[PDB]
Ligand binder design. Sequence first.
Ligand SMILES: COc1cc(C(=O)OCCCN2CCCN(CCCOC(=O)c3cc(OC)c(OC)c(OC)c3)CC2)cc(OC)c1OC
Ligand SMILES: CCCCCCCC/C=C\CCCCCCCC(=O)OC[C@H](O)CO
Ligand SMILES: CCCCCCCC/C=C\CCCCCCCC(=O)OC[C@H](O)CO
Length: 381
Amino acid sequence: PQDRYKAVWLIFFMLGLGTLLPWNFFMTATQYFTNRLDMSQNNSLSAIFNNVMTLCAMLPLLLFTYLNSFLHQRIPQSVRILGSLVAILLVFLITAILVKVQLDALPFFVITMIKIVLINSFGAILQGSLFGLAGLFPASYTAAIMSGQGLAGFFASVAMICAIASGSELSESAFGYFITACAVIILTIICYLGLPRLEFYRYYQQLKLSIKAILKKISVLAFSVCFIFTITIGMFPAVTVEVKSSIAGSSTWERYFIPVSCFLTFNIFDWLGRSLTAVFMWPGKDSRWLPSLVLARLVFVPLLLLCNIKPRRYLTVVFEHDAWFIFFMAAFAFSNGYLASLCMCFGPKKVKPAEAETAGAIMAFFLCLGLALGAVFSFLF
Ligand SMILES: COc1cc(C(=O)OCCCN2CCCN(CCCOC(=O)c3cc(OC)c(OC)c(OC)c3)CC2)cc(OC)c1OC
Ligand SMILES: CCCCCCCC/C=C\CCCCCCCC(=O)OC[C@H](O)CO
Ligand SMILES: CCCCCCCC/C=C\CCCCCCCC(=O)OC[C@H](O)CO
């Protein structure tokens, strides 16, 4: 088992980047979708876009990670991975074209929501199939996917900041997002196609030659990863983007405080947390400390809620200084990426090799169940 040059590891890293960089770029272009709806409409469509997008994203994402966990064995992995990648590529290509064509508000809203359902439907299959595949490899190769996903969040943050500072129209920034995603998806496909000729890949993928029982074996890590993202999506981004600076010296802060202090902070430390797990995985697959630290994250709900949210009707600002918010976001984000990566890395290793693929697929569903439960909870918070 010699991953010569770490080619397979790097390919798995690129696969993670590819799974989320398009969707992350889509999310960072929300301002383009809402502003486009406002300049078209003559209870509005922009006022409901975020909530309808959320519903059109989590419900498909959850349904198809669930189905994949039950049916991944009936479809070849290359069909599930390459087929999903090609579908997402086509949808983002269309998303890019719609930037340049005139279309009334309601058709644009509807067509966009349809594409959002396809992105998360094929995204579910893609992600469920990647973690299942990675379940056959050492734990470090699931961390490669998680790490690559974190970089996708980092690039998304850099793009958001650069778009604001560019001064360009939201539409031409969004068009750049979507074209970049298309190119990244194409690169991701090329990298995947290079795996079969690598001996390290064939060595663990060779091992292909009772869902209820598998679920019991990974239940601790499956439920932990679910609780990780219940908290995370519960608080981020819907709640945290409402925080305002209390030390800003210039009106130039206003448009940069959130993309910098919130989004950039989160994606930097989330990415670094995921990346650390490729080399350092304390407390280990059997330690009860891992679920315990996942539980401890509950503390971030009061902490962040009592930061400088303005306007606010009912609570007080206990932590008004920006430093509190940035610090909470860093620990909030680092604990997410690190513990989440540990859960995904360890889940498949609580089971025999012939079941590690299904274990990874189930872990993907519970990760997405956490995303969905967080969206529900955050829609009260
Ligand atoms: C497709 O699979 C995933 C989806 C999400 C995901 O979509 O999370 C959010 C869930 C609920 N959201 C619904 C969709 C829209 N969104 C609001 C979009 C506006 O947000 C952003 O601009 C944004 C920018 C970022 O970077 C600049 C982010 O970090 C990457 C980000 O994360 C949610 C959102 C609300 C929350 C997260 C994942 O791993 C972390 C996935 O991999 C399993
Ligand atoms: C903002 C920073 C961006 C972060 C960027 C990601 C960091 C990459 C991590 C580890 C490199 C390990 C990869 C080792 C290089 C392998 C290249 C390879 O594929 O080797 C075979 C090649 O095709 C024939 O020479
Ligand atoms: C804006 C400045 C932020 C950018 C800073 C770039 C830092 C590089 C990435 C993560 C650092 C955290 C520790 C990195 C350890 C990663 C382990 C690794 O990549 O090696 C995996 C290899 O394949 C073994 O199997």
